[PDB]
Design a binder for these strands. Structure first.
Lengths: 489, 705
DNA sequence: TAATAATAGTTTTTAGTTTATTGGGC
DNA sequence: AGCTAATAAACTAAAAACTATTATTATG
């Protein structure tokens, strides 16, 4: 979807950060630096098509575009960029605190009125497409209003006003996390998670606007527009980008089939494909070849209906594909299917059709299940009720049944390994893992910006352990041995 | 895989005897077998074939064998099948005028196959025979054929025009095929063959009894020569006491060609002028070829392309740890999602062979999560050559040893978050009983399972998984199309691919009944730009036809052009134009004649009467004498009904002075010329007692009477 | 006199080839 | 004690969806 979200980290310029704030752990100065960078990095790998920046409201040395006092801009409103990470790395530790003294000092008053106003000006500056806007703010106090109410009034008044503008806010507890402690100026209209903020997302690039739409039909008389979305795919790799030896820029790739006849040139028209079949030379052109790849026009002829007798536990082609009735050009799509979405639990006879992605693609016998709802507690209607068109195997796809073909064996071993099977178990968290191999590469890739061997090597609860979960299930499994002579040597 | 095959073919008109709408089993079998051969050769499969015929006009089999081997023409011998041979199969093998025992040809097959099994490496012996049952049967050879299939152990397969397991169909069921309503020699051959072949193959016999149409569509020979799953050396380790070796096998694959469309030029038809050259210039305004080894392969990071080597990434990458396979997680079978899947292949895993203990353990292990309805999450690291795969293994049911199949499960990275409103709450549209019935009308009318009884498990009356990728044979169609016919363009549309895939017509017509009213219930409208782009096949319906103008060779086609951009000449040129249907410019120009007769000027009516009296010859010479006489009778009355003393008196004057009639529509004009005179005029009538108009009338009637 | 409208411009997949590769031998 | 084979990953082009645009005619 066209649209760009923006989130900006707002930090204060006064004492409170450099002091640990009644907590033996690292100062809110320190812990912020670590957390923001971690979530910075996550957003970087999340997207580059996104605008980022950080500013220090308050200052001892003015440094912003508009040159208003107590304003220190540190990051320009930027897309993610490795040099930025390069310059952000060195804020860490007491040395970073020294820099903070060098760059601005430490400690300066503030006025959220100007602070909020100039931030909106920052957003008014960017002309890019605008989807969403949010602010990450940091403080240790529960209320800046230990002074005249005019600032407090001005702050809250335009807090609603920027709410009319539509900026979602979240104040983090830099004091005692949670504890119902920090609530004095923020139980109002003003809108713990810190570790989960850092542990929020890792190695993901969000996509949008799913492709592959086509039109269905009932009989050759009528066709209906419908948008087919894709649920899942395989893991992709980033396209490698060639670079020069040391100036490190790409150069052309230029395939040019030279001729041994004269050293001259060849034409694609001169190219006509060949099958070397013994003495039977076969010479066909590309387009007649490409036409041979076609059998029928992109379309869906409905075969009919089919009960819940298929789905033999032997066949699965490429993953099925979401279907949604879209008013692309056929005026009226879901109005017909207003009667089938209900006709799902009350009717399990499924339907199938062959499918053609486009011309040059074989027709694909494919079966459909209309889709149901699992709207979650907070109205989370994941997998909207549509249709799921599963493929079906072809004759050439089916494999031979193994020739060794006999009857099963005793359940005396079932007795022993009952205790195995119900002892250790997991929750089937389908969201308990990613590709650790892949993200490690990312970790390897970007590691060449901070001079560290490999950062945050993570292998979550996805590999079994020869002793940890062996004995978590217990050596009872070691005790259960009822098949004599383990054939292994 | 390896096999031994001998081609026992049929030749005979009775064995090509058929009915319109159903192809000749001679040709049906030939199409299936050239399919076998094209798959045999195009896919580069090695086998030794041999061709023998029965019912041949004459015999070529050297073994007379008591004249039981007559009409047997041995054609091919042990060599790899070749395109010319298959071309011979298409060409030479045509239904003759001779019938010989199919069982005698069966003895031919065992003889040659036993000749060809002498020291020849073969992993399979198979026999191929097809006959529409119009040849004599026999019984004296039952013992020798049984001992041949029992001792020499040569497999065989065949099909009939009858299926054992309405509308005419090339591959579907046409008219009902009664194997009892046929002549008894067919049935006797049918009975003798079936008891033999259920004796040899056991229970592999009844399945290969199709109608020749059904074998023409679905699997008939594919299964006999099919690729078996290949072993995978693997091991299952659980805990630290027990570890069992396992063998994995793939079940689903994307069919593809090992070969490539080798590039040859059209002028030299060879690869020897297409030698590779791919060069890389510095892409600056100044091009500058960079040496390939000078490459650096960086990756995009944010807006930056951080330069990366390969050997580095070759080192600090992470990989799966070996060809290992062991379960990790557990949960019940109900938690799985039909939608939450990957795995382009399907993999079936069993124990390592020659070890029944591992099979017993797996068979025992299957029982647990089967009686427990349990599913296990097994980690899949097939080897170090890729990252580990992940997902749940589900049990597989079977009449024998069960199985487990690993399926990949979605990552967080690969999951889409496209969320959409629920149409159930769509206030804009609600299901109506009308569309409900429209939906229901096809729910019950249309189904592809066989539904007659509960004890009879529902099955696909028109199976779909028993049909391979259509492209490959369609490829094979054009390959032989060009191989046998180098000059012939593309192979034709070749309906039969649709027919093997066409829905059951009876079901389709059964669909035609409700879908018609269902459509008409709720017709729908569509927007524009829903059409293909080009249509430039030829400039017209056809290139051209060859007619041409003839019969006017005078050398004055023009150059004296009949210039043409109604007193006398316009009408005369119009009647000279009596060349197209002769019925025009005369039926409607008489009004012009009238208004030209208006007697406003003397030449007006004189040239008026000349035109008519010139028209009279035209219709005589333009075959319009019938309308001529029609107008003759018409004109006189038409000029007398509106009577004035000026015109008509002269009209009849000129008329009767030069009225000319020659027999047209019989003596009609002869009567017209025999009678052309006047009639006396009587006293005018008064008799007007309705208004005072008679006043002036009576005034006149009394002044001067 | 000047609103409207088919249109290609970027990626995104995706599928066809390309590769270097353990596997067993004897 | 000499010998190699299917193969995912990798590498390609290929068509597309979605944007974002621009001629095109009423209008005067």
């Amino acid at each position: 979807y066209s649209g760009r979200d923006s989130l900006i980290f707002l930090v204060d310029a006064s004492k409170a950060m450099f002091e640990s704030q009644s907590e033996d752990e690292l100062t809110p100065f320190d812990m912020s630096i670590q957390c923001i960078q971690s979530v910075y990095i996550s957003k970087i790998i999340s997207s580059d098509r996104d605008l980022l920046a950080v500013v220090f409201y308050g200052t001892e040395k003015d440094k912003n575009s508009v040159n208003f006092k107590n304003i220190y801009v540190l990051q320009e409103l930027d897309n993610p960029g490795a040099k930025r990470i390069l310059e952000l790395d060195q804020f860490k530790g007491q040395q970073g605190q020294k820099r903070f003294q060098d760059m601005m000092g430490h400690g300066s008053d503030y006025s959220l009125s100007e602070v909020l106003w100039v931030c909106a000006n920052l957003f008014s500056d960017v002309q890019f497409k605008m989807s969403h806007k949010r602010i990450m703010l940091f403080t240790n106090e529960d209320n800046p209003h230990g002074n005249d109410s005019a600032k407090a009034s001005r702050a809250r008044t335009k807090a609603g006003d920027l709410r009319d503008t539509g900026i979602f806010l979240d104040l983090m507890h830099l004091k005692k996390p949670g504890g119902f402690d920090i609530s004095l100026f923020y139980r109002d209209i003003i809108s713990s998670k810190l570790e989960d903020l850092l542990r929020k997302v890792r190695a993901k690039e969000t996509r949008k606007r799913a492709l592959s739409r086509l039109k269905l039909k009932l009989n050759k008389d009528i066709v209906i527009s419908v948008g087919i979305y894709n649920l899942v795919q395989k893991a992709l790799k980033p396209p490698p980008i060639k670079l020069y030896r040391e100036t490190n820029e790409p150069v052309k790739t230029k395939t040019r089939t030279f001729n041994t006849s004269t050293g001259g040139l060849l034409l694609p028209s001169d190219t006509k494909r060949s099958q070397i079949y013994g003495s039977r030379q076969i010479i066909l052109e590309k387009e007649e070849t490409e036409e041979l790849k076609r059998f029928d026009d992109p379309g869906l002829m409905l075969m009919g209906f089919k009960p819940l007798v298929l789905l033999k536990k032997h066949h699965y082609l490429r993953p099925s594909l979401f279907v949604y009735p879209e008013e692309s050009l056929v005026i009226g799509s879901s109005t017909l299917f207003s009667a089938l979405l209900i006709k799902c639990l009350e009717k399990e006879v499924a339907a199938l059709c062959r499918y053609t992605p486009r011309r040059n693609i074989p027709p694909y016998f494919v079966a459909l299940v209309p889709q149901e709802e699992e709207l979650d507690d907070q109205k989370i209607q994941v997998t909207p009720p549509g249709f799921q068109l599963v493929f079906l195997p072809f004759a050439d796809d089916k494999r031979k049944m193994p020739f060794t073909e006999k009857i099963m064996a005793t359940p005396e071993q079932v007795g022993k390994m009952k205790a195995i099977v119900e002892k250790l178990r997991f929750t089937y968290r389908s969201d308990s893992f990613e590709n650790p191999v892949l993200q490690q590469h990312f970790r390897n890739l970007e590691a060449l910006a901070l001079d560290l061997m490999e950062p945050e090597q993570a292998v979550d609860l996805t590999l079994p352990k020869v002793e940890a979960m062996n004995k978590r299930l217990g050596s009872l499994v070691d005790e259960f041995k009822e098949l004599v002579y383990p054939p292994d040597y | 895989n390896k096999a031994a095959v001998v081609l026992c073919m049929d030749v005979g008109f009775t064995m090509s005897n058929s009915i319109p709408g159903i192809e000749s089993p001679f040709e049906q079998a030939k199409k299936v077998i050239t399919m076998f051969v094209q798959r045999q050769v195009f896919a580069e499969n090695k086998d030794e074939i041999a061709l023998v015929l029965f019912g041949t006009d004459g015999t070529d089999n050297p073994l007379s064998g008591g004249d039981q081997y007559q009409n047997i023409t041995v054609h091919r011998h042990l060599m790899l099948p070749d395109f010319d041979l298959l071309e011979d199969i298409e060409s030479k093998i045509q239904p003759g005028s001779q019938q010989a025992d199919f069982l005698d040809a069966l003895i031919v097959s065992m003889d040659v196959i036993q000749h060809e099994t002498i020291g020849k490496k073969f992993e399979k012996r198979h026999i191929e025979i097809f006959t529409d049952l119009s040849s004599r049967f026999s019984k004296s050879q039952l013992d020798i054929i049984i001992h041949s299939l029992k001792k020499c152990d040569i497999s065989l397969q065949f099909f009939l025009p009858f299926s054992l397991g309405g509308p005419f169909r090339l591959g579907g069921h046409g008219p009902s095929f009664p194997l009892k309503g046929i002549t008894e020699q067919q049935k006797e051959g049918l009975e003798i063959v079936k008891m033999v072949m259920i004796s040899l193959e056991g229970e592999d016999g009844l399945d290969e009894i199709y109608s020749f149409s059904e074998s023409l569509r679905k699997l008939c020979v594919f299964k006999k020569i099919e690729r078996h799953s290949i072993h995978w050396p693997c091991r299952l380790t659980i805990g630290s006491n027990l570890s069992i070796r396992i063998a994995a096998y793939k079940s689903i694959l994307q069919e593809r060609v090992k070969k490539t469309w080798t590039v040859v030029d059209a002028k030299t038809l060879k690869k020897e002028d297409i030698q590779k050259e791919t060069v890389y210039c510095l892409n600056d305004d100044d091009e500058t070829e960079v040496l390939k080894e000078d490459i650096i392969q960086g990756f995009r990071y944010g807006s930056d392309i951080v330069p990366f080597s390969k050997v580095d990434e070759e080192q600090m990458k992470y990989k799966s740890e070996g060809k290992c396979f062991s379960v990790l997680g557990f949960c019940k079978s109900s938690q799985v999602q039909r939608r939450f899947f990957m795995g382009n292949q399907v993999l079936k895993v069993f124990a390592a062979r020659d070890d029944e203990a591992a099979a017993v353990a797996l068979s025992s292990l299957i029982h647990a999560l089967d009686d427990l309805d349990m599913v296990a999450i097994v980690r899949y690291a097939y080897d170090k050559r890729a990252n580990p795969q992940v997902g749940v293994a589900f049990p597989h049911i079977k009449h024998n040893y069960e199985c487990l199949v690993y399926v990949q499960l979605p990552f967080m990275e690969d999951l889409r978050q496209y969320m959409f409103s629920s149409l159930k709450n769509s206030k804009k549209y609600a299901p109506t009983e009308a569309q409900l019935n429209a939906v229901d009308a096809l729910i019950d009318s249309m189904s592809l399972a066989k539904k007659d009884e509960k004890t009879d498990t529902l099955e696909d009356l028109f199976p779909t998984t028993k049909i391979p990728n259509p492209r490959f044979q369609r490829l094979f169609q054009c390959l032989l199309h060009r191989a046998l016919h180098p000059r012939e363009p593309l192979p034709p549309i070749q309906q039969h691919i649709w027919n093997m895939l066409n829905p059951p017509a009876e079901v389709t017509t059964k669909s035609q009944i409700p879908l018609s009213k269902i459509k008409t219930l709720f017709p729908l409208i569509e927007a524009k730009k829903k059409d293909q782009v080009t249509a430039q096949e030829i400039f017209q319906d056809n290139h051209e036809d060859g007619p041409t103008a003839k019969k006017l060779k005078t050398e004055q086609g023009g150059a004296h052009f009949s210039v043409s951009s109604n007193p006398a000449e316009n009408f005369r040129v119009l009647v000279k134009q009596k060349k197209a249907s002769f019925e025009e410019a005369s039926n409607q120009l008489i009004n012009h004649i009238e208004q030209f007769l208006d007697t406003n000027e003397t030449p007006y009516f004189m040239k008026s009467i000349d035109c008519i009296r010139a028209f009279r010859e035209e219709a005589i010479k333009f075959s319009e004498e019938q309308r001529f006489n029609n107008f003759l009778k018409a004109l006189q009355e038409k000029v007398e009904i509106k009577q004035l003393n000026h015109f008509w008196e002269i009209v009849v004057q000129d008329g009767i002075t030069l009225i000319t009639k020659e027999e047209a529509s019989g003596s009609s004009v002869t009567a017209e010329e025999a009678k052309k005179f006047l009639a006396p005029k009587d006293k005018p009538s008064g008799d007007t007692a309705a208004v005072f108009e008679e006043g002036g009338d009576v005034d006149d009637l009394l002044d001067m009477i």
